[PDB]
Amino acid sequence: PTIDFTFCEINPKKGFGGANGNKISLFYNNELYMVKFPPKPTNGCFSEYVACHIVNSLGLKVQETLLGTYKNKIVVACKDFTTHQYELVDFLSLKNTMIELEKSGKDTNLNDVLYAIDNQHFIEPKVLKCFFWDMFVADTLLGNFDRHNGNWGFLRASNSKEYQIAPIFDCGSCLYPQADDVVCQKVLSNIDELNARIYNFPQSILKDDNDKKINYYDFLTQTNNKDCLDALLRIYPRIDMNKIHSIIDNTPFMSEIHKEFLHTMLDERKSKIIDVAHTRAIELSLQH
């Protein structure tokens, strides 16, 4: 069975931001979900569901997701984590405070993002930095091309000065959302084609000091950033390609060709990037 969200009670007193589609607030299992629609003619909902589930299997706190129908559309339902007086403040907002940078908090220069993390006061700077790096590692595996400063952040309970890190959310930009059944069968059949979708792009939205988008493969097979390496060592063990392939297999609605596309691509991303980087990480770390 596939879920039908159509007749779930709509909450008319809530909306959500973002430009990437419509959202409504609705009740399901007696709890609030942010239901994200696609733009009418949906690969963004799929990626959202698969990816967040993959992020959960990695032991990272992430929003809970479901796929289901709603009238004419396939949509991903995301458990609302800003009910009960919780409020979401993106990293973009927090970076906007870094006034001595003379950069907008929307700019994704890596060094600046890290500077912002080291100088902010919502969250223990060291805790937050481990989070950010955990996320980059999971975004590497997922091939996330859009982790802009607006796509992560913090919850503040109302009436307090207290922040926690918010569940990972919006992974809709992960796992090749642009790929047709047609694009799939082509990538699987052409080695130079698949290779390019590991080594060349998707690339990370974070940029180096020459303003060039960060290449996942080039970056973490060459980085000497002890925090990034450490996060590789933290997370690698929690990758479970069986659980992951199983997530993909049990994904509702999705076509078998697309499933096959994600199986192969996730494996390739796992071996071509994570493994190579992780094996180097051990090597340097054992170096005493």
Q: Tell whether 79 is in a known binding site.
A: yes
- Does 174 interact with ligand ADP (rule: CB under 6 A)? no
- Does 18 interact with Mg ion (rule: CB under 5 A)? yes
- The token pair that represents 232 in the structure block: 């590789």
The CA distance from 198 to 281, in Å, is 20
Site map 164..193 versus Mg ion, x via CB under 5 A: ------x-----------------------
- Does 170 interact with ligand ADP (rule: CB under 6 A)? yes
Among 2, 7, 12, 17, binds ligand ADP (CB under 6 A): 17
Cβ proximity to its own copies: between 35 and 277 the closer is 35
Among 29, 30, 40, 288, binds its own copies (CB under 8 A): 40
Shortest distance (Å) from residue 250 CB to its own copies: 27
Judge contact between 188 and 264, C-beta under 8 A: yes
Burial of residue 235 (CB within 10 Å: 0-12, 13-18, 19+) is buried
Q: Tell whether 151 is in a known binding site.
A: yes
- Does 94 interact with its own copies (rule: CB under 8 A)? yes
Length of the chain in terms of residues written: 288
How far from 38 is each of 197, 224, 281, CA to CA, in Å?
24, 40, 39
Query: Residue 34: which of 49, 44, 23 has the closest Cα?
Result: 23
Among 82, 119, 164, 223, binds ligand ADP (CB under 6 A): 82
Window contacting ligand ADP (CB under 6 A); options: 136-144, 166-174, 197-205, 274-282 = 166-174
The CA distance from 9 to 11, in Å, is 7
Shortest distance (Å) from residue 169 CB to its own copies: 15
Site map 176..215 versus its own copies, x via CB under 8 A: ----------------------------------------
The CA distance from 52 to 9, in Å, is 24
Shortest distance (Å) from residue 151 CB to its own copies: 13
Judge contact between 177 and 47, C-beta under 8 A: yes
Q: Tell whether 22 is in a known binding site.
A: yes
How far from 73 is each of 64, 70, 128, 232, 250, CA to CA, in Å?
20, 5, 37, 38, 19
Q: Tell whether 249 is in a known binding site.
A: no
The CA distance from 219 to 110, in Å, is 11
- The token pair that represents 37 in the structure block: 């629609």
- Does 169 interact with ligand ADP (rule: CB under 6 A)? yes
User: Which residues bind to ligand ADP, rule: CB under 6 A?
Assistant: 16-21, 34, 36, 63, 78-82, 88, 150, 169-170, 172
